[PDB]
Amino acid sequence: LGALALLSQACRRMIDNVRYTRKLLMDHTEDIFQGLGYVKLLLD
Amino acid sequence: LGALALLSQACRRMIDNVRYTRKLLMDHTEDIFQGLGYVKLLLD
Amino acid sequence: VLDSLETAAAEAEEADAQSEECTRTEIIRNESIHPEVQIAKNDAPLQY
Amino acid sequence: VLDSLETAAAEAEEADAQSEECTRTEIIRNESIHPEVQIAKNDAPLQY
Amino acid sequence: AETRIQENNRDVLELIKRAVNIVNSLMEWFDICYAQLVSGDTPADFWKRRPLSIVPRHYAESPSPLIVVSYNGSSAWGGRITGSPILYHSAQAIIDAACINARVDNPQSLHVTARQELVARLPFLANVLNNQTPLPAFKPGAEMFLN
């Protein structure tokens, strides 16, 4: 059961890493959108 | 040994798919950067 | 798929342990005791 | 870890196969035997 | 690129479904009836049977998209009847690479090799490097203050 538990833990951590990467990408895109909006406001 | 070979092939295919997805993401980010640079040049 | 493989491995190991303990119990016993039933003289009873 | 698990599974498989073969070979031997009789036929008894 | 991504995703889904399965543990009558009932045709009905194309281009001056309709039965701009339509490509990557080669946005202050490559790739851009018909900057809307 140790190998199965290790595999389950690896799957859980890779899922968590994928979710964290997706959240980071969403935050980066939101920051880019906010910067573009600020640039547009500065040149309005 | 057939099941082990199939598992190894599945692992290799999933690694290749992950690498292809990473390369596609890098290409997309590079294209976005080039487009932003072209937009900046057009408004220079 | 990983969970299904884990459950299959668990059941396979459980079956292997059951077979091992059954064989160990058979070894401890002097003779292989098996159920018998037959209504006659001292003949060979049937095996279940 | 997966490679280690598969090697452990293979070694356990061959170990239990060897154990099953050993138990099957050991079950064959019975060594019951019967005591002396009152001389089979009329010239040769059944001794040890 | 989007079509390639979609087909790759559909292939991945198909192979996942196959692995799961392996291891577990036609308007002819409608047109006739419409012709019989309505008994009238308009140009905005023949193109309804085929997918259309919308190319909106809005602006902050007025909240109204600039809807553009393109014919689907002809090999025009935006039509998809035989294959890949016009994409207007192969004219930006070279310019971006030339601009990023020396980290200078202005092509006038680039190397001779970059200028030669730009001239060869873009025949219409050779008339700017020779400095013909001088004009102050590039102001297309000069008629107003000129007059």
Residue A23: what residue type? K
Residue E60: strand, helix, or coil: coil
Residue C20: what residue type? E
Residue C36: strand, helix, or coil: strand
Which residues in chain A have Cβ-Cβ distances shorter than 8 Å to C5? 4
| Touch between chain B and chain E: 3 or more Cβ pairs under 8 Å | yes
> Which residues on adjacent β-strands are paired with residue C47?
C36
Q: Does C2 touch chain E (CB under 8 A)?
A: no
Minimum CA–CA partner of C1 in chain E: E25
Please state, in angstroms and rounded to a whole number, the distance separating the CA atoms of residues E145 and E140: 11
Q: Name every residue whose Cβ is closer than 8 Å to that of residue D5 and which is 6 or more positions away in sequence.
A: A3, A7
Whole-number Cα distances in Å, C46 to C40, C42, D28, E117: 11, 12, 20, 99
Which residues in chain C have Cβ-Cβ distances shorter than 8 Å to E15? none
Question: Are the Cβ atoms of E23 and C4 closer than 8 angstroms?
Answer: yes
CB-side exposure of E26: number of CA atoms within 13 Å? 0
Query: Using CB atoms, which chains have 3+ pairs under 8 A with E?
Result: B, C
| Residue A20: CB atoms within 10 Å | 10
Residue E99 burial by Cβ neighbours in a 10 Å radius (0-12, 13-18, 19+): buried
Q: Does B6 touch chain D (CB under 8 A)?
A: no
Which residues in chain B have Cβ-Cβ distances shorter than 8 Å to D6? 4
Q: Which token pair is B16? A: 């290749």
End-to-end CA distance of chain C: 40
Please state, in angstroms and rounded to a whole number, the distance separating the CA atoms of residues D3 and D16: 20
Please state, in angstroms and rounded to a whole number, the distance separating the CA atoms of residues D2 and D12: 15
D9/chain C closest Cα distance in angstroms: 9
Please state, in angstroms and rounded to a whole number, the distance separating the CA atoms of residues A16 and A34: 27
B5/chain D closest Cα distance in angstroms: 11
Question: Are the Cβ atoms of E23 and C1 closer than 8 angstroms?
Answer: yes
Please state, in angstroms and rounded to a whole number, the distance separating the CA atoms of residues E41 and E31: 12
Please state, in angstroms and rounded to a whole number, the distance separating the CA atoms of residues E57 and E64: 9
Minimum CA–CA partner of D8 in chain A: A3
Question: Are the Cβ atoms of C7 and E23 closer than 8 angstroms?
Answer: no
Torsion of CA E105, E111, E112, E115, to 10 degrees: -20
| Touch between chain E and chain C: 3 or more Cβ pairs under 8 Å | yes
Residue E69: strand, helix, or coil: strand
DSSP E108: G
Q: Which of C1, C2, C11 to mutate to test the interface with E (most CBs of E within 10 A)?
A: C1
Q: Which token pair is E72? A: 């689907």
Q: Does B4 touch chain D (CB under 8 A)?
A: yes
Residue D1: what residue type? V
Minimum CA–CA partner of D9 in chain B: B4
Query: Using CB atoms, which chains have 3+ pairs under 8 A with A?
Result: C, D
Residue A16: strand, helix, or coil: helix
Query: For tokens 């293979």, what's the residue?
Result: D10
DSSP C37: E
Closest CA to C1 of B17, A8, D4, B1: A8
Asked whether the beta carbons of E95 and E86 are under 8 A apart, the reply is no
Measured in residues, chain B has a length of 44
B-contacting residues in D 8-37 (Cβ below 8 Å): none
Please state, in angstroms and rounded to a whole number, the distance separating the CA atoms of residues B22 and C2: 24
Query: For tokens 């690896």, what's the residue?
Result: A10
- A1 closest CB neighbour out of C3, C5, C10: C10
Please state, in angstroms and rounded to a whole number, the distance separating the CA atoms of residues A19 and A1: 27
B9/chain E closest Cα distance in angstroms: 13
Q: Does B41 touch chain D (CB under 8 A)?
A: no
